[PDB]
Amino acid sequence: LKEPVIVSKMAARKKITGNFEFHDPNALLEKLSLQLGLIWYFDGQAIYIYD
Amino acid sequence: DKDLLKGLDQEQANEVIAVLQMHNIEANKIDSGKLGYSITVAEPDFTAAVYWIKTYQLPPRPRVEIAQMFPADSLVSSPRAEKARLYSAIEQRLEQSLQTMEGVLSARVHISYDIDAGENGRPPKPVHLSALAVYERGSPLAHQISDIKRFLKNSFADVDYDNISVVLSERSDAQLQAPGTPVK
Amino acid sequence: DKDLLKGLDQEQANEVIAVLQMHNIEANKIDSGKLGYSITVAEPDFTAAVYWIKTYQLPPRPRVEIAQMFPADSLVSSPRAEKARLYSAIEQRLEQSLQTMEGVLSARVHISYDIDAGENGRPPKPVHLSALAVYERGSPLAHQISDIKRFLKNSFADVDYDNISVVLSERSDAQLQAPGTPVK
Amino acid sequence: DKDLLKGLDQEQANEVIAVLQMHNIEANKIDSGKLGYSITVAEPDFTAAVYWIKTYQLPPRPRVEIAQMFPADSLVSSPRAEKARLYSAIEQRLEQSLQTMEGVLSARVHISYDIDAGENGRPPKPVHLSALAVYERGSPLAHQISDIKRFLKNSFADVDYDNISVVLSERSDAQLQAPGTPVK
Amino acid sequence: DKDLLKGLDQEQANEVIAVLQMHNIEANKIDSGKLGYSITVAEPDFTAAVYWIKTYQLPPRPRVEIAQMFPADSLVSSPRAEKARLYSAIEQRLEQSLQTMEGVLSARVHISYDIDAGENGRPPKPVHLSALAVYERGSPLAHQISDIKRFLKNSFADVDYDNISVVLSERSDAQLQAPGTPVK
Amino acid sequence: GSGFVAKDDSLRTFFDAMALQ
Amino acid sequence: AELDSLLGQEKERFQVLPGRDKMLYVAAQNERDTLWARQVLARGDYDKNARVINENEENKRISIWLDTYYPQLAYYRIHFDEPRKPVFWLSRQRNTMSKKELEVLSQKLRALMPYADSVNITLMDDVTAAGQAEAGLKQQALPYSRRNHKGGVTFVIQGALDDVEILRARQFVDSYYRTWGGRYVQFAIELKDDWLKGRSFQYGAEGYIKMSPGHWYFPSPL
Amino acid sequence: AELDSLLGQEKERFQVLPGRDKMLYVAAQNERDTLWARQVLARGDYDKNARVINENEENKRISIWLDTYYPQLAYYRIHFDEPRKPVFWLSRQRNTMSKKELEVLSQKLRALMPYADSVNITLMDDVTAAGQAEAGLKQQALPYSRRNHKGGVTFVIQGALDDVEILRARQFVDSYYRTWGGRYVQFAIELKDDWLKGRSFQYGAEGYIKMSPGHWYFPSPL
Amino acid sequence: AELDSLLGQEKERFQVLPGRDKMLYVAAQNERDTLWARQVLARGDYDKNARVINENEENKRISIWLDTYYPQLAYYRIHFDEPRKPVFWLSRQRNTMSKKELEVLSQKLRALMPYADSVNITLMDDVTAAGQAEAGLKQQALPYSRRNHKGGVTFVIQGALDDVEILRARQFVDSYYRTWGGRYVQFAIELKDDWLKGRSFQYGAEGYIKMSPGHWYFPSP
Amino acid sequence: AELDSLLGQEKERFQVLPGRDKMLYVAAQNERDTLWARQVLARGDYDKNARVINENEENKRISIWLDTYYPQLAYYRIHFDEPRKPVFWLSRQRNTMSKKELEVLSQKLRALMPYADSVNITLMDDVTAAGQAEAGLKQQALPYSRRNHKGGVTFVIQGALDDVEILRARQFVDSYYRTWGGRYVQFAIELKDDWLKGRSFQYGAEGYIKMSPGHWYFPSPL
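ok -> structure tokens follow
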């Protein structure tokens, strides 16, 4: 992703493990935000992530 | 004429002869008074009899029970030794009680010993049992697992049916004819 | 006529004899009363016999148990020194319970010894087992590895089917013929 | 007949003779009753024999175990002197059990010792094992590490396959022919 | 004959003779009953033999172990002494285990000692090992450091491959021929 | 085919897994 | 003294067959009687030459010769219910042999068995060998899994089986192996616990295991 | 005192063959009977010269001569089922020798073994030598990883295998090496700690992708 | 008493060759039999002259002689499978010797080996010698790294290898040194502990290793 | 009593040579046989005059005579593979002596060694001596650094080497010193820890060492 990511405090208590591969991140982030349970937003300068 | 074991017990000598005469070599049970028994074979049978002594790990050492490590004649006794002496007389008594069934010749029962739960307030875990048995032949031993799993199910506090394992089997072929002396 | 070992035990001399007779040399067992047994060989086989004494590390030491290090006739007994005497009798009677299965001639069982994890607020850890066996030849020894695991599983508190490891094998070819004297 | 070692033991003379007769010199084992054994070689074979005594460092010292430094004739033993006497009976019993596999002639097992972790409050680390073995020749000794690692994996609390190291080898060439006397 | 040394025991006389025979002078091992042995050389070979005694620092001192200076005959023992007596039996058992590998003739193993880490609050330091070995000639010496560094890596808690150092070497040229008597 | 195998789940981790279907 | 009197009293558990190379074969039926008959000839109370044969041992003796001089062959088992005429059970849908080549195979198999008289070669269907193996595996109510491939099938019986289902799965495999051998169809009984032990997971083509209420693990698609 | 009488009572396990160089060869069939027949000739109760040969020693001896006088030869094994006429399994698709050059080799291998009368050279195929390895590895239900490359193939069995799969894989490998050998195809049974037994995937944005087989493995938390 | 009867009972492990300088060479095979036959000639129960030759120290003797009189020579090994007619493997692509001095070198090696009758010099290839060392190294599934330079190649084996991989490496290297020797191609086996065990890391072009949640390790290429 | 019988039993580890000044030289080949033969002549069991020579000692005895009477000479080593005709390796690109001046040197080196017959002087190239040291230093994969100057090169081995790299360097340097000598190229192996031990430094033409997070040290440009 060409922009910095800001992760909140309550949505950083979850954990992830495995081998991943970011060929296209804007399509990978939609799938992980539905499996983990998350909301996100891109306001032109950063990508905020909440639960 | 050559001897291979001496100073044996009565049940040790009755097991060495029972192993050797199954493999077509005959022995001799010679008494000696206070020094026990002694077992002698012939000269051409000596090479085979030493091999079956090494293979079958004869003479048999005596069978061990848990109540021999914590004897009742000790001067003090911990509660770990009182609970280990209770469970060792129950698994000795269910084995005595399984031989009075229909067709069983021998049996061996094990209980799951629990020690570390006695000091702390955590409740002890469930109790697990396991049994072995040898039936005489002509018995349909597939339908006789559900009678041991029913008999020793409610002989304890609360077991499940998948916490009991019964591994039983039929006995070997009978040995009735004499071995035969070596023709020299 | 040359001696190679003397002052042996009855169980030791049958293990030196059963090893020398496998490699076509012939020994003799000479008693000496209080001084134990003694083993002699011929003169041309003296060079070969010392090579198998050095290779097989004969005479064999007596087998060791964990209950030998902590004797039952001591004055005081720590609770650390009581769980090793409990586990050493459990692993002693599970291998006397495995020789009563069909086909099996010998067996050896090991338990995981966890004593340090008990006397704290930490939870106890799991218990692991391992076994070895020597089966009579002619048996489908790949299907009997699921009966020792079933027997060994629920004789403890809570083990898994992948925390028990059984390594078993069939016995060697029998030695039935006499070695043969050196033709001199 | 010049002598070079006196007062030897029974298990030491069968090692000095087995080392010398591999290098084509003939030795003699002379008993002396209470004063042990003695070894005399010939005078042409004397200069080589002192060189192999110095090289192989014969006679061999008796093998050391950890349970000999902490004897059980005390009144109160420390927990360090009880974990060392427990681990020194497990690493003896595992190498008594490794010689019963199919093909092994000798084996030696080392366990990592943990002592200072019990004095503080930090939990002890995982245990590490190591083993050596000597095989009868003719065996595919690359596939036998899968059987020794599987046997050693769950005989303790929790090890990984990265914490066990097996270094094994095949036995040397057999010595069967007589050395030969020096003619002068 | 002019005497050089007297009162030496059995293992001190066989090394002085093995040193003098390397340098073309021969000696005589004369027994004296209770007073040990005695080593005499000829008359023209006296000035050389005194020089090689002074150079090689003969007779040898008895070899020293760390557990000799902390004997177990004290009524109570410090933790420094019960921790210094354990590492000195580990560095002897790993040294006796290195001689059973193939090709090895002699070996020595040194462990790093720590004694303040048990009495402080800071964590204990890492463990460092160091070994020497003497190999039979005709062997590849490069590919045998990778086996000792694998065997020594997991016989302790956690050592790295940088904290182990193996310095090994092949044995010297053999001495098989007799020295020779001085003619006059 | 898809599906979920719940073993004593706490009804928040169960309905989070249905948020893809 | 004859050989049939130098064995035991019961003259029915052995059968002495005269060979074709001045020898005398003794036909035992298990390992215990094989060691009984070998103790007589090994201790040496017989002045002639004799051997002790067995059905399980001879079935591997003439299967070592057959995977060297006749490789790429499809057969099942040799039956010794009448030891003077063994019956060779060949496969039908996996061999390309004509009748003249079967006559040579029946002649070269006769020289390895000097006690025999005429080996009879018969061919059987390759479908009923797996049909009887699946029909006997469905009567005992054993959960299984069939894997078909070329030159053999495989039945996999896994899971946490109870004690009457290890006994019924062993009494059937031994009775099938006694009559058909293990060349074509092979049973793989494997007693193991539940994979993904107490863990909740979401299966099928995009899988994850929940190691904890706040922990996701992404291995192979479960 | 003939040589067959100085051995044991059972005159079935040892075979004595006369040599062309005025010697006498004893043909044992394993390591346990080679030391039996070598003790007789070592203690010296036989007046003339005699030697003991073996199937795994006379196969290791003529492979030191062969990779000096005939390098880059593609062969498998020398079979000694009938020791007067051994058969030499030579590869077909990997050599370019003519008929005369195969007769010079069949006359120079005869001089190494003086007990033999003629040596037979048979050209075995190369696709059935790797087809029987994969069909026998698929029939035992084992996880494997075939790595094809030029001049020999290899099969890798990694993972945290259990006790039934270790026994079935070790028994099949030891039953395959006895027939073909270890020149072309090599098995690589090793135990690491991962519940996925050899295979490994990566996950991103489309599903899973089967990763390339390499030496690094993931330490499995489970 | 003849020398072939003065040795052990098994008259099959030694071979007594008549020398041209009126000596008697015994040709053992390994060091265990070399020290078995040197004790006989060292205790002195043989009146004439005799020597004990091997395959390793005879190969080091005329390789010490061949770097004084014929330096810059490319060769591999000397094979003594028939000790009356040894085979001298020589490199083909790394020498410029004609067909005239290849008989002068054969006549000079004949004067240094008095038991031999003729020395058959063959020319082996440098592509097949490194091809068999790479094709054998790939078949055992080992991680390696080939370094081609002038007059020799070098295979480097790194990583945290386990016990079955450092046993297949010793069994392949010791079986390759027996054939080609260690003059041209050399294997180097070093083993290191792994930095990444419980670490999370990014591989590929921009690679790093997170040694902690707040610690990055950018390794140098 | 001749001299070749007063020595050891085997008459091939020593070599007796007659001298021109009525002396009798004994040629050994290491220091252990030099002391084995010096002990015999020192204890006094020989009548006439004799001496014991070596190769590393006789190569140092002639380097004292050459450092005085022929200074500024570029040579490598005298080889004694045949002790009646030694070979003197001279340098080609670093001398200016003619053909007659080589003959007056070879006739004065003959009188210094009275056991020889004719010293052979061979001009050796100078880039092959420094090329073989680098090619041998690159096969073992050792980190090195070459420093060329007029009249010798230098290979510096530094850093924290492990245990197998010291064994391969000690096996290669001692095998190069045997055939060339240490007159031209010298290997400088030195084992030391890492410089600037636990410090973050800034290298190149404007250098500072950070002795602490708040302490700058400005030595020579790192």
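The longest helix of chain C spans residues 80-94.
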